[PDB]
Amino acid sequence: MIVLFVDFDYFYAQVEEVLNPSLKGKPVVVCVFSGRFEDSGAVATANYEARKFGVKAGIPIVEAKKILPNAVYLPMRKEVYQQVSSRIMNLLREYSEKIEIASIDEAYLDISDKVRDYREAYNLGLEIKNKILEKEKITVTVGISKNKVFAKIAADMAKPNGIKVIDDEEVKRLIRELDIADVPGIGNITAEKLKKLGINKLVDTLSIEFDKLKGMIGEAKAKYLISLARDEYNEPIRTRVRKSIGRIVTMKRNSRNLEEIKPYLFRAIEESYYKLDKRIPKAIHVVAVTEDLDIVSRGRTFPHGISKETAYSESVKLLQKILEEDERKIRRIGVRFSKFIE
DNA sequence: GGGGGAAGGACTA
DNA sequence: CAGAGTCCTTCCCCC
Ligand SMILES: Nc1ccn([C@H]2CC[C@@H](COP(=O)(O)OP(=O)(O)OP(=O)(O)O)O2)c(=O)n1
Ligand SMILES: [Ca+2]
Ligand SMILES: [Ca+2]
Ligand SMILES: [Ca+2]
Numbered sequence A: 001m002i003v004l005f006v007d008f009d010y011f012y013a014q015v016e017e018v019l020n021p022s023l024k025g026k027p028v029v030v031c032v033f034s035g036r037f038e039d040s041g042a043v044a045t046a047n048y049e050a051r052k053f054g055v056k057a058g059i060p061i062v063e064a065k066k067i068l069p070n071a072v073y074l075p076m077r078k079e080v081y082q083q084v085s086s087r088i089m090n091l092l093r094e095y096s097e098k099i100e101i102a103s104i105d106e107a108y109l110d111i112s113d114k115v116r117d118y119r120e121a122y123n124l125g126l127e128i129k130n131k132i133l134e135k136e137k138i139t140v141t142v143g144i145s146k147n148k149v150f151a152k153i154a155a156d157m158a159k160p161n162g163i164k165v166i167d168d169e170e171v172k173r174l175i176r177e178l179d180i181a182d183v184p185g186i187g188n189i190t191a192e193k194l195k196k197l198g199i200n201k202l203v204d205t206l207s208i209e210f211d212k213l214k215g216m217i218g219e220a221k222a223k224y225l226i227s228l229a230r231d232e233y234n235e236p237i238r239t240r241v242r243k244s245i246g247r248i249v250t251m252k253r254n255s256r257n258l259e260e261i262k263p264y265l266f267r268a269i270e271e272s273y274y275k276l277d278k279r280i281p282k283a284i285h286v287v288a289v290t291e292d293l294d295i296v297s298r299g300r301t302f303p304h305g306i307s308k309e310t311a312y313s314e315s316v317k318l319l320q321k322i323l324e325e326d327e328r329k330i331r332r333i334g335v336r337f338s339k340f341i342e
Numbered sequence B: 001g002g003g004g005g006a007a008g009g010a011c012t013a
Numbered sequence C: 001c002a003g004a005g006t007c008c009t010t011c012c013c014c015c
Helices: A011-019 A063-065 A078-091 A119-136 A148-158 A168-177 A187-196 A202-206 A219-230 A258-275 A306-324
Strands: A005-009 A028-032 A042-046 A072-075 A098-105 A106-110 A140-145 A163-165 A242-255 A282-292 A295-301 A330-342
Touching: A005 A063, A005 A078, A005 A119, A005 A148, A011 A028, A011 A042, A011 A078, A011 A295, A028 A063, A063 A072, A078 A098, A078 A106, A078 A119, A119 A140, A119 A163, A148 A163, A148 A168, A168 A202, A187 A242, A202 A219, A242 A258, A242 A282, A258 A306, A258 A330, A282 A306, A295 A306
Parallel strands: A028 A072, A140 A163
Antiparallel strands: A005 A106, A005 A140, A028 A042, A098 A106, A242 A330, A282 A295, A282 A330
16 A cells, blocks of 8 residues: 655645745735734744744734734635645546545545555656646645555655655654654644653554553544554545535624624524535534633534525524523634535 | 434644 | 634433
8 A cells, every 4th residue: 555645835825825926935924814803813824934933823913923023914715725726636636546635735645556666656746746836836745655644744744845755664663763743643632641651652552551542542542543553554545525514703702692693603604505515414513612712512413404594593593502501702603514415 | 332413622734 | 812624532312
């Protein structure tokens, strides 16, 4: 099994560059303006010109302006990025029918039947890079290896505009000299939780008795890390299928007033249904982000598809159930639809 | 003692 | 200051 991972570089900021080359060289910060207070909002993405100084995704726009007051700030234009992505994703499609689109800027190729050593995998990946660049002026990063996880890791180390391979040899080394916190799927909450157990490297998992691991990080994850270090990660590249679509929005001011929230909830619904394509969902979940940034949600599943009018009706009941069963003020509200009729 | 569905939360990209 | 989607886990109904 020879996986070829592709990952566009700071996609949103780069797409803004391709559309406006004058931005090339200058730090670019694509952000989401919440509309609460002037420059309120968060940073969605930024090019390396800004990354170098600490301006990264997740930080407050204000903060970003205190670090790079002269950097260029652009509002996020998801729709554009999405179309550019689609075009690229189609290019990749021509290099293997076995392709898994993980996200708007990530794809996993299973070139096992496409190549034989790793020398061409590298070369193949080279063609993919010179292809995407030649057609969309977008630089990406390729990470080749024996499985999705390591492929990604390879890519993580080679970004930006790179391409790294991981010989079964290095796979062995990494399982020993790589901080388990650089391993896909292991986040701060599991990173520390692991450290407490003394595990700092992937192989350190092979020691600890099982039930102790699948006791503090759950069975599933426990295995995942094990099978990975024990060099047995299987997981094939299967075509991903969107299982849920939805939209959440930030209100101008925290409220607990049903009549003050409805309008935000409905706008979120209109957008979701639009994005729903022709998909008919049987389940709808109203999601709310509290004042303390807590996330609560009430949903429901029907024995039939959901009509926009029913979405409007059921979403309001669920929102009420939320306000009944909770006291905190709501900051962000939204909806999400799933279980699409096939 | 699990299958299946609801609500939480971890991580993601 | 703090802006989409998948999977895993827990608690509960039910066979
Ligand atoms: N707090 C955060 C963190 C990340 N993201 C988004 C930013 C784009 C996507 C992927 O992030 P990275 O892959 O880390 O960066 P990138 O811009 O996608 O490109 P690169 O992979 O080269 O860093 O996740 C986000 O919306 N909010
Ligand atoms: Ca990327
Ligand atoms: Ca990590
Ligand atoms: Ca990443």
